[PDB]
Amino acid sequence: SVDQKAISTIRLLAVDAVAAANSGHPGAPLGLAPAAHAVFKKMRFNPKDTKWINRDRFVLSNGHACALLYSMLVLYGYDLTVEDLKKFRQLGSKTPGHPENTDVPGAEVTTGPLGQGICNGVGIALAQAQFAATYNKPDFPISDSYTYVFLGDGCLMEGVSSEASSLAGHLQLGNLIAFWDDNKISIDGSTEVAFTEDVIARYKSYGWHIVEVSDADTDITAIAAAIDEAKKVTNKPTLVRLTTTIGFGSLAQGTHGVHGAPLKADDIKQLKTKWGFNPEESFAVPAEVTASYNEHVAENQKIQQQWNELFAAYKQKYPELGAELQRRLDGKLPENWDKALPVYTPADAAVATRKLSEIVLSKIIPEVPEIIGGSADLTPSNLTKAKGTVDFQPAATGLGDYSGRYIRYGVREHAMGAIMNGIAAFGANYKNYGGTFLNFVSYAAGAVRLSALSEFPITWVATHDSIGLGEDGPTHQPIETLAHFRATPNISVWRPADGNETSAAYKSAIESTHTPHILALTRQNLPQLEGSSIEKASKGGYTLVQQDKADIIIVATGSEVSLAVDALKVLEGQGIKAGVVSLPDQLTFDKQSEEYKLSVLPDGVPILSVEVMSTFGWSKYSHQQFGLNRFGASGKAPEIFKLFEFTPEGVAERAAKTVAFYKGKDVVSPLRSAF
Amino acid sequence: SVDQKAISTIRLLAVDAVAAANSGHPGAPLGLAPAAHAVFKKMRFNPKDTKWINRDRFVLSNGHACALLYSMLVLYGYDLTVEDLKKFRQLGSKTPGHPENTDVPGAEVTTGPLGQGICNGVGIALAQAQFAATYNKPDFPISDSYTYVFLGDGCLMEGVSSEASSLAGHLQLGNLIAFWDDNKISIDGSTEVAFTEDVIARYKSYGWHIVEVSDADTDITAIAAAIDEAKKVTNKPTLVRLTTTIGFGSLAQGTHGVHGAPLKADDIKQLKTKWGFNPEESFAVPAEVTASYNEHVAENQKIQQQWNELFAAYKQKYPELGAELQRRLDGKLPENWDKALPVYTPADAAVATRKLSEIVLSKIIPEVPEIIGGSADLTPSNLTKAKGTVDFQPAATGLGDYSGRYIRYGVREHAMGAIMNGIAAFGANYKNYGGTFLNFVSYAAGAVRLSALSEFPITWVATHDSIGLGEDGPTHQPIETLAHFRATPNISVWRPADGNETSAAYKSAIESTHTPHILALTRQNLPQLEGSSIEKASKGGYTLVQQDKADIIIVATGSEVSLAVDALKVLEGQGIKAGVVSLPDQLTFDKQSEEYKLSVLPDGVPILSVEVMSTFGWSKYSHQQFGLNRFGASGKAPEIFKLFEFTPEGVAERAAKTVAFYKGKDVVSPLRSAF
């Protein structure tokens, strides 16, 4: 039949791509081609408009299987061709060895690190539910799309997927439909060696609906029926068990050897002849398959055409909501939204930056509807919920509504990070955030790194940033954490010192379109600084205290800026004149012009950094570094600062030693380099 | 009764400790005191010998509840007193705000980061099973101890605990008995807001046995009976559901407010009078409670006395095993074990460092019985299994035996990391390891950091270290990873360049007693270096190529050392004389004498670092840094190195620019500092 021919075409495109690269993963593509065919036939999408907001989304969580995804995208006439398939896994191609949303049209998210994609799918589905609750009206189903996810045994073993699956079940996300590739093979062989749990029973325990397809190597009728069944269960996410043979059709089917290396040439020949293809030909695309797939595209395009007319009629019936929706689909924040950001003067009281963050959120959430966010069971500690908002919960629980704006993630940092990526991936200008203690952002590193690689404007509200948290002690006190994330490409790591800097950090985080943000915030109160402003802090680094005859410049962040200012006064009594630089975000600073940066960190003066965590990275900006390169302690925070000599006198002593060390030396800016 | 008085004593010690600190967590201690009393009465332990190898182990996974643990340890006469309780959460005390194994007698592991302790308990139980299978003989139950773990809702939400619980069920670890504090309260309030899964059904799906105690606020008879029941189920780990009231007895019982802040003074008074204590008194220890607890200690000490005689008789009946066991309990490796380490010359073939690692393991595993380890579903990629060894599996599966040495962790990096910590915590000189790709060690950061803080000699076999892995692309290629772990205190991060350096890295990792190791290993082949040796590489950094008239020194690691040597030859043709330093472990190097370090990185010569990952940290050792501070690419590895100019000519160009940049300047070693 044409459907059988399409499935064979998909299988053989994937195998031929792996063969051409002499690299990659043929097994899961062979096993999942029937399901991919069936799911894409049910999906609504436009290959010529990858951003249609009411499209169904597809996520390949088992991202190593991407020859399958690329084959689907090629067959459906996305901006990806057979010539791109021939360049699978080749430097610079549009067909990288794992899918990247920045590079691959029709890749919603970046997968490959196992477990991430299913969590991203939870976030896409969460966003869709929130979006539909916000905009849909009687006779106006603006948003009614589904989220389809493929995942394998590896994703099911990774703890992040358990976190997200527990939460998705709690949230009753009925438009999420996931498909488990139940092939009983991973890299180490049979799943009997390490993965003998009853997956189905576990998913029932989370509140998911289950459909089992016992012959998913052939039974596309049953796969389609499973989708129809899942769509009828509106208050539970569904897991469809696809019992498949890894490498179906290969001489090596059902073995670990077919997972992750090219097939033998003779194996590819017998695949082709068994399925009616020419064993001498590669990258075959039968015209009847193209015709069948084109019919579905044309139908989908007529659906989008009608949606566009629905949207026009919505703008007439609901003028304010329609304009808001239009603005969001245009990627624009509300005009002058930033006028809501709080501004402070040096006469205002000291405030912890976690509390300044609460105040910002309280002002901007009512003004910017596309802001939603939550906390990983730290709401009263991170201060992430604006008073008067409702939680995102299914109304059936009585605990919230899908129109709500605040997410109770539970103690699930890693899934929170990956769900945030999915909310961003949904689109519609969502600017979403997640709170935890800074030290436990590290639990979510797998997802955080993908925020950076995927260029998603997500925000971590990362409170209790240092030994300043006090008594909880060294298991809670960051040392390495900022260095880790600053060393990752494309992460803005804001460590604001005061009220104006906190507003600048949020301006950056909310305006972002391509860069994730981590906001490192204090437990403890900090003074409002003389010389701070949103304008200056928006440059990432700025001269807080200018001293034309400086003997030294002290560069600091966060809680250590006030310390530097107090040290400047001690130094004055020692006959040493200091300037102070505040560096609330190193990435933003790095992006400023060379001349601006040199105005902050000039030649001809020693520069000392002060930050109560690792000294890694700080030599970019300083000649000498005063940091904390050992674990912390359990005690009252001021006593810990004293123990480690993070006091005005301790900073002044090191500043004086720095001045002495450079006596008789020629000093150039740390910004200078040989290449 | 005396038992009732003991429970009240525990509750009130915990509340009084929190009160004295005006900080900490009274709720779970109040709720779990009956269970703690019951479990400790069943446990075999010696407060005067915390290292008795046949003790039962206890782990408080909900580590914030540590006022409970400290109260138990004080009551039982560990090296912890009421005076220490009065110093709870105070700087320098033996009663930190979360338990630390380095600081607290009777704390087996360091907890506080949720989810870790239960996984550590899985590792203690895994080790006990392996140890018993190795040493027990008829009439000689050398090892027959249990592992008791308390955990809360937060631990159950963290994905790491799902990973470890799936694996523990697969492994049929019948001597593991965990207790869930089912109090339905976390920081954000009721668990109804975020955690509505059927926990019991999930644990059944993993293959655990369940016992439910519906009135765990009072029913110590049922808690004791649950332990007895769990001990009869020898082929399943057991979860005991303890339905408790958080803060039991407080006016604020059953509320989130009792979780994490001191009780009001009037509340403490009414607790005391309800339970027959003097409301004017704090830190009361009734002598009848001490007497009862002392009776159990005395009985346990007679059990250990008899075990010592059993061990003496074992040494007579089984002379070789007995001597091996004695050596391990003395903390000593086999005499001259390191003579098994492979040695290479520059005439030997190029080898990838992952393959060199396989060869090391193959030589040392037969010689050092306390080495066990595994991989997170990457055995044929990491090359972590020695041919001819058997996997650690329950014999009932037919897939291995508990005497086996190789663990199939599945796709569970985070739990693997925390399980490794538990295996180390068991003791008996275990030197255990875990393989994954370097980029996915990051999934396990929560546990890795605790290896460092806990001072456990665990080893990550972290292969596919860089863009050298090629086609899998940027989702798999480390950039930030070494900087992250090098910035963490107390992590040795070895990046060996060749065969001799790989042997030095393993010598360090296996000899370690207090420092975790990460071995960053290549996919791709590297040449054997002229000038390398185990002796020199054991110093962490060494002069590979000495040049008395050097214009520049190039310092490099791993795959970039050979690149530096090739660049030296290009530079010679440009009239520039270079030396080369290899820096296989920065931590080991840092620990050498100042004079040794200066002999490697002297004054008076520019130093350029080369390493194909982040430049963070490298200014400790260099004036200029050539690194990779952007994400990678999907293509054949040599083409990626060329793209980024990590070629002999690209290094030489940057070296020449470095020489030019320092013309006319006075240069001192990067090792010099102002303070």
Ligand SMILES: CC1=C(CCOP(=O)(O)OP(=O)(O)O)S[C@@H](O)N1Cc1cnc(C)nc1N
């Ligand atoms: C183990 C592993 C794989 C097997 C999947 O086994 P699974 O059953 O999911 O795939 P199948 O055998 O094709 O059906 S792929 C490769 O990613 N990898 C390394 C890998 C490990 N850890 C993480 C976080 N991401 C990864 N990418």
Ligand SMILES: CC1=C(CCOP(=O)(O)OP(=O)(O)O)S[C@@H](O)N1Cc1cnc(C)nc1N
């Ligand atoms: C959320 C959170 C807690 C509530 C536990 O809720 P749980 O039900 O386990 O404790 P109970 O309410 O006392 O019964 S504690 C504090 O650790 N914390 C922050 C916290 C967050 N993430 C990680 C990895 N470790 C942590 N430590």
Ligand SMILES: [Ca+2]
């Ligand atoms: Ca599989």
Ligand SMILES: [Ca+2]
């Ligand atoms: Ca709880």
